[PDB]
Amino acid sequence: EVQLVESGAEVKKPGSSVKVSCKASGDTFIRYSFTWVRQAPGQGLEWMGRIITILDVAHYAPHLQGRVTITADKSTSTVYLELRNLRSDDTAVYFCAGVYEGEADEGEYDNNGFLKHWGQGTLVTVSSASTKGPSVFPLAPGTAALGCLVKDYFPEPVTVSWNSGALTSGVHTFPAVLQSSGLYSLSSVVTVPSSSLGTQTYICNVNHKPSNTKVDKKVEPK
Amino acid sequence: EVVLVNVTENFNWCKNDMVEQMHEDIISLWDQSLKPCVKLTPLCVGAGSCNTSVITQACPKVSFEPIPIHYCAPAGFAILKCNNKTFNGTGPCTNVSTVQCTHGIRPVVSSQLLLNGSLAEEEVVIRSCNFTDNAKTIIVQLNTSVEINCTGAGHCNIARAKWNNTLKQIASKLREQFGNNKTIIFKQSSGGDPEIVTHWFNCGGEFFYCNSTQLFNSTWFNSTGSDTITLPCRIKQIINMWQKVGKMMYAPPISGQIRCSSNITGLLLTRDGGNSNNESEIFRPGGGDMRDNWRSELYKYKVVKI
Amino acid sequence: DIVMTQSPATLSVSPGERATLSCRASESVSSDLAWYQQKPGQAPRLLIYGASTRATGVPARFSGSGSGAEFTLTISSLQSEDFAVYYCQQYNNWPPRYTFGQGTRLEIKRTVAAPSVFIFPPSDEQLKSGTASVVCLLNNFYPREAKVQWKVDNALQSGNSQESVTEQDSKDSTYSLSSTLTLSKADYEKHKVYACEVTHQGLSSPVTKSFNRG
Amino acid sequence: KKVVLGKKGDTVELTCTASQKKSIQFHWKNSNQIKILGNQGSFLTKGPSKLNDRADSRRSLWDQGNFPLIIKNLKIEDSDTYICEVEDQKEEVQLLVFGLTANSDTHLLQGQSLTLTLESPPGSSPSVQCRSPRGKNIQGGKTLSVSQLELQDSGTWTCTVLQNQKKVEFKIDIVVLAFQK
Ligand SMILES: *[C@@H]1O[C@H](CO)[C@@H](O)[C@H](O)[C@H]1NC(C)=O
Ligand SMILES: *[C@@H]1O[C@H](CO)[C@@H](O)[C@H](O)[C@H]1NC(C)=O
Ligand SMILES: *[C@@H]1O[C@H](CO)[C@@H](O)[C@H](O)[C@H]1NC(C)=O
Ligand SMILES: *[C@@H]1O[C@H](CO)[C@@H](O)[C@H](O)[C@H]1NC(C)=O
Ligand SMILES: *[C@@H]1O[C@H](CO)[C@@H](O)[C@H](O)[C@H]1NC(C)=O
Ligand SMILES: *[C@@H]1O[C@H](CO)[C@@H](O)[C@H](O)[C@H]1NC(C)=O
Ligand SMILES: *[C@@H]1O[C@H](CO)[C@@H](O)[C@H](O)[C@H]1NC(C)=O
Ligand SMILES: *[C@@H]1O[C@H](CO)[C@@H](O)[C@H](O)[C@H]1NC(C)=O
Ligand SMILES: *[C@@H]1O[C@H](CO)[C@@H](O)[C@H](O)[C@H]1NC(C)=O
Ligand SMILES: *[C@@H]1O[C@H](CO)[C@@H](O)[C@H](O)[C@H]1NC(C)=O
Ligand SMILES: *[C@@H]1O[C@H](CO)[C@@H](O)[C@H](O)[C@H]1NC(C)=O
Ligand SMILES: *[C@@H]1O[C@H](CO)[C@@H](O)[C@H](O)[C@H]1NC(C)=O
Numbered sequence: 042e043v044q045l046v047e048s049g050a051e052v053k054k055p056g057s058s059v060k061v062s063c064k065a066s067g068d069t070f071i072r073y074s075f076t077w078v079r080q081a082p083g084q085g086l087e088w089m090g091r092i093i094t095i096l097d098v099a100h101y102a103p104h105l106q107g108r109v110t111i112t113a114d115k116s117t118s119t120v121y122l123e124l125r126n127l128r129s130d131d132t133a134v135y136f137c138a139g140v141y142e143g144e145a146d147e148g149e150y151d152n153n154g155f156l157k158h159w160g161q162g163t164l165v166t167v168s169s170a171s172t173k174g175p176s177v178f179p180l181a182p183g184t185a186a187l188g189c190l191v192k193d194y195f196p197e198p199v200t201v202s203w204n205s206g207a208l209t210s211g212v213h214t215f216p217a218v219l220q221s222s223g224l225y226s227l228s229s230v231v232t233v234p235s236s237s238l239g240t241q242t243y244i245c246n247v248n249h250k251p252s253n254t255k256v257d258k259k260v261e262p263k
Numbered sequence: 264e265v266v267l268v269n270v271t272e273n274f275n276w277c278k279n280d281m282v283e284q285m286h287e288d289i290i291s292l293w294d295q296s297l298k299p300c301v302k303l304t305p306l307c308v309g310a311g312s313c314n315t316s317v318i319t320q321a322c323p324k325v326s327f328e329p330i331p332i333h334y335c336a337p338a339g340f341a342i343l344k345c346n347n348k349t350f351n352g353t354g355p356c357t358n359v360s361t362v363q364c365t366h367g368i369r370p371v372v373s374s375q376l377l378l379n380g381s382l383a384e385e386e387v388v389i390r391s392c393n394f395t396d397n398a399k400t401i402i403v404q405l406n407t408s409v410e411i412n413c414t415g416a417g418h419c420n421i422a423r424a425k426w427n428n429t430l431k432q433i434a435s436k437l438r439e440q441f442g443n444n445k446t447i448i449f450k451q452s453s454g455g456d457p458e459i460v461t462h463w464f465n466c467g468g469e470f471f472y473c474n475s476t477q478l479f480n481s482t483w484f485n486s487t488g489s490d491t492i493t494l495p496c497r498i499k500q501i502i503n504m505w506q507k508v509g510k511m512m513y514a515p516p517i518s519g520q521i522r523c524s525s526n527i528t529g530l531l532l533t534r535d536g537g538n539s540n541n542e543s544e545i546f547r548p549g550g551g552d553m554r555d556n557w558r559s560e561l562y563k564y565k566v567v568k569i
Numbered sequence: 570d571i572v573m574t575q576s577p578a579t580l581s582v583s584p585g586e587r588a589t590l591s592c593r594a595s596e597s598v599s600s601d602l603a604w605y606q607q608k609p610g611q612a613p614r615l616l617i618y619g620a621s622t623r624a625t626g627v628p629a630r631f632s633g634s635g636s637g638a639e640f641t642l643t644i645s646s647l648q649s650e651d652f653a654v655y656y657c658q659q660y661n662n663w664p665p666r667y668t669f670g671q672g673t674r675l676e677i678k679r680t681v682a683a684p685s686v687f688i689f690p691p692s693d694e695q696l697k698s699g700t701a702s703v704v705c706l707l708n709n710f711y712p713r714e715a716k717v718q719w720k721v722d723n724a725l726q727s728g729n730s731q732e733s734v735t736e737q738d739s740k741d742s743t744y745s746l747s748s749t750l751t752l753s754k755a756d757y758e759k760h761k762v763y764a765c766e767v768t769h770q771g772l773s774s775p776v777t778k779s780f781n782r783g
Numbered sequence: 784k785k786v787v788l789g790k791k792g793d794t795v796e797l798t799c800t801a802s803q804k805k806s807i808q809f810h811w812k813n814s815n816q817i818k819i820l821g822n823q824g825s826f827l828t829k830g831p832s833k834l835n836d837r838a839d840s841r842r843s844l845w846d847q848g849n850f851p852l853i854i855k856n857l858k859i860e861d862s863d864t865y866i867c868e869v870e871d872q873k874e875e876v877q878l879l880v881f882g883l884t885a886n887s888d889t890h891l892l893q894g895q896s897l898t899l900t901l902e903s904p905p906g907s908s909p910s911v912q913c914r915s916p917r918g919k920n921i922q923g924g925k926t927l928s929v930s931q932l933e934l935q936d937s938g939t940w941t942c943t944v945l946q947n948q949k950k951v952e953f954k955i956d957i958v959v960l961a962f963q964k
Contacts, residue, residue, distance in 0.1 A: 078613075085656065085669055085670070085671045085672050086605075086607075086613065086656055086658075086669045086672075087669065088658075088666075088667045088668060088669065091665060091667075093301070093512075095501070096301065096303060096501070096510070096512065097315075098301055098303070098317055098319075100319065100664055100665045102666060103570075103666060136612055136613070138612075145501070147457075147497070147499070148457065148472075148499035148500060148501040148502065149497075149499060149500060149501075150500040150501050150512060150515075151500075151515055152300070152500075152512075152514065152515070153618075153660075154601060154603075154658075154660020154661075154665065154667050155603040155615060155618040155619075155658065155660060156603070156605075156613075156615060156658075157615050157624060159612035159613060159614070160612065161612060162612055176695070176698070178691075178692040178694055178695045178702070179692050179694070180689040180692075180704055181689070181692065184685075186685075186687040186706060186708065188689075188704075190692075190695075190702060190704065190749075192695075192702065213708070213735050213745045215733040215734075215735060215745075215747050216733055216734075216735070217733075218731045218732075218733050218749075220731070220751075226731075226749070227733065228704055228706075228733070228747045228749070230706055230708075230745075230747070232708065300663060305842070305843035305844075305846065307843055307844060307847060308847070313843055319663075319664045320664070321663055321664075322663065397816065397818060398810040398812070398818060398821055398868070400823070453818075453828075453829055453830055453831040453835065454828070454829030454830075454835050454836075455820075455826065455827045455828040455829045456826040456827045456828075458826055459823060459826045459827070459828055503825070503826060504825055505824060505825060505826070506825065507806070507825050507846070508806060508825045508842045508843070508845050508846060509825070514663075533818075533828075535818070535830075535831055536816060536817075536818070537815050537816045537817040537818070538815045538816050545831070547831075549823065549828070550823065551822075551823030551824045551825075551826035551828065552808075552823045552824035552826075553824060554824070555823075
């Protein structure tokens with residue numbers, strides 16, 4: 042069983058190129074074929090292409106032909122995807138995937154088109170926007186609802202916790218939306234006993250790793 | 264067609280343009296029939312980095328089955344045929360006629376064993392373009408055919424008694440050529456490409472790779488078992504091209520009942536040789552160059568300017 | 570080009586019951602058909618290949634059938650971990666131009682639960698920066714479908730709000746939704762009442778929450 | 784007489800060129816007429832020689848009239864004269880493989896000895912010259928010996944072997960330990 046580990050998240054300006062990698066370990070490399078599949082936020086899966094590792098031959102989806110290249114380095118058991126002339130609509134999670142083809146070094150080859158093994162994915166954001174940390178605002182309050190608005194950051198993702206992880210019950214952190222500005226925004230809300238206000242302080246912890254930003258905003262009545 | 268009287272023609276089977284033309288026609292007969300899913304050929308013409316030409320195409324499964332091919336005289340030439348029942352392809356032929364076309368040749372692609380071919384009319388015959396050269400193929404023509412039954416389930420069967428008797432007749436002819444005081448030894452292939460190390464052939468459209476060690480493991484005229492020989496085989500999808508240097512990929516089989524029974528009518532062998540005061544000769548199964556295969560049938564023909 | 574089409578887009582099934590997922594091809598793909606399962610945030614998982622062969626580790630309650638241009642994924646008894654998105658994939662053609670269906674979302678079917686609606690005015694800190702975001706929250710409802718409308722001074726708003734919805738809750742099977750209205754400080758101080766009107770199957774009459782600016 | 788020098792354990796390439804840019808029949812043999820490796824049509828064959836598992840060609844060059852004999856993991860016993868028969872011609876090449884090892888893989892101390900020994904094929908009578916990182920030079924035949932190492936001798940030594948005009952280079956890493964006075 043091969044384990045696929047992909048490289049870190051990428052942020053690119055439209056028109057740039059990206060090259061993402063995928064280290065296969067655990068089994069005999071040249072006996073697998075490797076496929077790249079991508080998924081735009083909220084969209085389905087899209088087959089990009091596939092390489093017959095043993096032969097060093099790759100085939101690509103027609104809508105991609107001419108600006109995509111899939112390669113494999115056998116000395117390092119690594120598969121590479123290069124996507125050129127990047128467009129904003131190329132923003133997606135890019136998955137490395139593979140399947141065992143038989144005893145290929147002995148000329149056996151099933152040419153399997155299905156995908157048994159998958160990498161953890163690589164987010165590639167393509168945008169004219171520049172990296173920046175979010176502005177965090179309070180959403181002040183039987184049950185009471187309160188939260189933090191996490192607004193105007195780039196790129197994804199951001200992580201949100203309450204009370205340094207001490208409060209988790211009734212927490213809803215919404216998936217971000219892309220604003221017309223090109224910047225992301227989300228809200229994290231939580232419901233608590235309305236009688237808890239005044240004797241329990243609630244603080245939202247917001248972490249945006251891309252901009253090395255870390256914010257903790259106290260949310261209060263009045 | 265018409266026998267020639269008093270005409271004595273000089274033949275040289277190792278320099279015969281019929282072999283080349285047929286080799287080309289059989290090559291083109293393979294392209295329009297058995298298409299690979301992927302085809303790879305080198306291209307290092309430029310004085311720097313190498314390049315591989317890659318072709319990808321639809322590769323329909325085809326239950327290949329060679330129809331006999333005739334070589335007919337091209338415009339401006341005529342085919343002379345030697346009628347000697349045992350002709351070695353070289354020297355003068357006293358009994359010669361002229362013919363329209365050759366007899367029907369089966370364009371079988373195989374190594375080690377010649378299948379569905381012609382038998383020697385009289386005794387076993389062995390041929391070579393240079394017996395002194397240990398690197399030249401030795402072509403064997405049997406006078407009695409030996410069945411080989413192969414299945415896509417992974418083996419070929421050969422009757423042991425028949426094969427043993429055949430080997431005894433090969434060994435006789437060999438020491439008739441290399442010395443009557445010599446021990447004749449058959450050994451497995453010494454190495455190289457799989458298509459050449461195994462008995463390799465195509466059957467029902469598929470490429471079989473059969474371990475022939477059991478066929479070539481005996482000593483003769485030295486000192487003084489199981490009903491059938493079962494060779495373990497393998498169908499493969501990634502093949503080394505015989506038409507030229509390169510590789511091809513085909514699709515996996517779609518039939519659960521691949522079967523074909525052939526007649527072994529000849530062999531392709533190489534002799535070890537090498538400076539050795541040892542009074543014994545080693546022979547191993549060979550082939551790879553299909554021109555040897557065509558020569559095993561065209562040795563008695565010659566094309567001449569009219 | 571072989572177009573794969575799955576139906577329905579969303580399948581709602583009560584726990585422990587059978588689900589049947591459909592996948593069609595625009596032309597025959599023989600049996601070169603695979604099914605994948607995907608959970609939010611994770612890579613897809615191979616379930617079935619060759620139309621009907623289970624992948625290693627796939628439990629027996631998953632079975633695929635069909636050939637040619639029509640295929641089915643059957644789950645005989647839905648477990649908690651079975652609720653996910655399911656994709657089919659065709660890999661019949663050569664040269665290879667493999668394609669996926671657009672997925673069927675299989676969710677947990679429960680009783681109708683009306684949303685609790687809350688409205689947040691913009692913070693002083695944000696107003697201090699020059700913009701005004703207003704947040705309307707619909708908490709813990711079922712089913713997923715809901716209509717949310719903004720009215721400023723009883724005037725229907727359009728083109729200046731954005732919605733976000735959570736994944737189905739792993740404990741009570743409900744959804745939550747935020748709707749955010751954004752306008753500049755200048756335009757925000759030009760109007761009085763800010764109301765979000767909410768429509769949902771669990772509510773008899775549309776619910777309106779509001780506040781008077783200041 | 785073409786002479787090629789090899790290094791024990793390394794790889795070597797022996798060249799053979801046809802007079803036409805086409806793929807034709809070739810075969811490599813040794814002095815004893817033992818078959819090493821050749822082609823049959825577009826396939827590689829390998830003879831019953833001791834080089835069998837370690838010998839190869841480069842088929843992507845055959846169509847260009849080049850038929851090399853590549854030999855990996857050289858052994859001293861590989862030393863021999865090799866003949867390339869092609870289009871009725873014979874390209875001959877004498878190959879000599881040499882080995883050169885330090886007498887210990889242990890880290891040495893200042894003032895201790897270093898002895899390098901040269902492995903050589905029967906018949907060859909090579910000259911060896913070596914140089915330490917500090918410029919220390921020693922020469923000899925089979926065995927080169929330095930009486931006392933200096934700290935400055937630590938690092939890569941470069942040894943050159945002279946045979947039939949040709950030379951081959953060996954690089955050998957030696958460690959000489961420092962200490963506190
Ligand atoms: C052929 O040889 C025979 C016998 O020597 C002779 O009688 C004859 O004249 C020659 N030519 C022919 C075909 O008549
Ligand atoms: C020459 O061989 C032919 C067979 O093609 C045979 O009919 C004939 O007997 C031979 N010629 C003679 C008269 O010896
Ligand atoms: C072929 O047979 C002829 C007898 O007609 C003989 O002269 C020749 O030597 C044989 N071939 C060779 C080269 O041994
Ligand atoms: C075949 O040839 C061998 C000698 O090569 C001979 O002993 C045997 O009798 C022949 N068999 C037939 C049927 O001609
Ligand atoms: C036959 O091979 C021998 C041994 O290699 C050699 O003398 C010669 O190349 C060949 N004979 C001729 C003259 O073709
Ligand atoms: C091969 O098959 C034929 C019939 O097609 C049979 O007569 C013969 O005995 C078989 N030979 C074997 C299995 O050795
Ligand atoms: C022929 O083959 C048999 C096995 O069938 C073997 O035992 C025997 O030694 C061979 N006979 C000889 C030496 O001619
Ligand atoms: C064939 O089988 C024998 C053992 O029976 C083995 O020594 C040989 O390597 C095999 N040949 C192959 C794998 O081509
Ligand atoms: C070769 O055959 C002999 C008997 O003929 C047998 O004892 C030996 O084991 C065989 N070796 C191989 C490689 O099959
Ligand atoms: C030999 O001929 C038989 C009978 O016609 C055929 O079925 C078989 O496939 C042939 N063998 C090969 C390798 O073409
Ligand atoms: C093999 O030869 C025998 C004997 O002539 C014949 O009966 C049989 O049909 C042949 N088999 C094939 C497949 O050609
Ligand atoms: C002859 O026997 C010797 C052992 O005495 C062996 O090394 C050599 O390979 C043999 N030679 C031949 C030509 O078979």
